[PDB]
Design a protein around this ligand. Structure first.
Ligand SMILES: CCCCCCCN(CCc1ccc(O[C@@](C)(CC)C(=O)O)cc1)c1nc2ccccc2o1
Lengths: 270, 270
């Protein structure tokens, strides 16, 4: 019954709104302007970066950074904090996916461990355009060029995310679509170490039926969007793995920079 | 209409049968299954290799193990020889996909360059089971144990394929399904260096529509088979990436000596 699939779609969309503070709808409204209510301050260099901690609420350093927690690292631990935060949000969203909390605890943990980062990059695309990315709840916007101008290692941490974002955004998905897609990503019965794969795939199949119907009704004129979106699932994997390696480089060149335990545990990955 | 889609499907199936030596239906009959007659020669150890190598359609080297071209190397070369053949067979199959030859010539070469490995591992599964892989037109069978028992470098060359195969085969696809799938793989669109992506994605869209109808008519009881198969592309991509990795290592294993020239040409890296 397509009626049950539509109900599942509403339910997941409802929990998504309740779980994530910055939706794509709000992100796009901020990025496309035509507003005076929520224009973001733009960080495109050191100066604007310095001033940035004056317009928005940031817990870092405004002045010089060379001999005092450099700008790169300063911005790195910023993402680190937001990431750890996105993990708790995604975890809260996961619990709302029918059947998720009824699964083996070890598997719930495993699904989150391998799914969180893939969800993070998928949603991060909502905050991006070819020129940059929204930061701190959308009050700021950090230019793509500025990020690429960071120190050797950090300078290329985001470039691959932008490349993925521009392609992914071309699909023109809205929040109601992403809510089901994100749920599909989580219930991947092919994650390493899964104990009971069958119950997991039974849920994903239900979610896939919901996603398919949702895309057919929401994008009547977009042929094979469903297949096209599912293929994007391969780009995420690449992003994640790619991210992991670079992370290993940081650890060796920045033995003074710390990583949050949570994030550190989720990698043992890949 | 569902008429052009069934025609497309039939067309690819025919071409697929004509282009490849052993069909999955055939390989299955031979593998786990009686079909008691002309049982394949089994390679399970060094001695069994030597015997088969001298008692089977082989064209390369002879069984000589004594500080010269170790066993593992001889097996590796055998896989390469068959791979060079598979490349030509996949190239012909590609030319039969409607619209393929009509694409920019450079794009055709690009699509084959990046899709051959994905296709090889995908079709390889048709010849694999959890205990081994059919070799030499199915005239042989090389056990999983034997392959894994090989040295540190070559021993972890086929195991990841076995794991992939095991999962992939659980989908119970047949030759008519795989024929369309392989075509989807070839008409990607995200291959680097492409010059005119539009016609490529337009063909894949047509191929995906044909694949979906095919799976729905051929596996009416298999819910969301289409979606599950598409997500398997994320597995292949990883396998392939991981494959060039071990390949780069072999390069740093065998190189020097004025022997093997022109042969290195025929192969290079594929
Ligand atoms: C799915 C629920 C909503 C999630 C919102 C995620 C916001 N985010 C995503 C992009 C990102 C950038 C950097 C990341 O790197 C790390 C190593 C964290 C330092 C990681 O998460 O593994 C990870 C993720 C991100 N947040 C920020 C803030 C400032 C600059 C860059 C940046 O990137």
């Amino acid at each position: 019954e397509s009626a049950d699939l539509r109900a599942l779609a509403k339910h997941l969309y409802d929990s998504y709104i309740k779980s994530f503070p910055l939706t794509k709808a709000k992100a796009r409204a901020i990025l496309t302007g035509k507003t005076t209510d929520k224009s973001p301050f733009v960080i495109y260099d050191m100066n604007s970066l310095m001033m940035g901690e004056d317009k928005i609420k940031f817990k870092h350093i405004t002045p010089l950074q060379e001999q005092s927690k450099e700008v790169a690292i300063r911005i790195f631990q910023g993402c680190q904090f937001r990431s750890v935060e996105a993990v708790q949000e995604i975890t809260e969203y996961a619990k709302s996916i029918p059947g998720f909390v009824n699964l083996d605890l070890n598997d719930q943990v495993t699904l989150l461990k391998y799914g969180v980062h893939e969800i993070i990059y998928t949603m991060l695309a909502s905050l991006m355009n070819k020129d940059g990315v929204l930061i701190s709840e959308g009050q700021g916007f950090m230019t793509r060029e500025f990020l690429k101008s960071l120190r050797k290692p950090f300078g290329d941490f985001m470039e691959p995310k932008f490349e993925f974002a521009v392609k992914f955004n071309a699909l023109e998905l809205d929040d109601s679509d992403l809510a089901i897609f994100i749920a599909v990503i989580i219930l991947s019965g092919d994650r390493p170490g899964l104990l009971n794969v069958k119950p997991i795939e039974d849920i994903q199949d239900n979610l896939l039926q919901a996603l398919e119907l949702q895309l057919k009704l929401n994008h009547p004129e977009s042929s094979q969007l469903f297949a096209k979106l599912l293929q994007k699932m391969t780009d995420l994997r690449q992003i994640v793995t790619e991210h992991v390696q670079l992370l290993q480089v940081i650890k060796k060149t920045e033995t003074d920079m710390s990583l949050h335990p949570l994030l550190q545990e989720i990698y043992k990955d890949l």
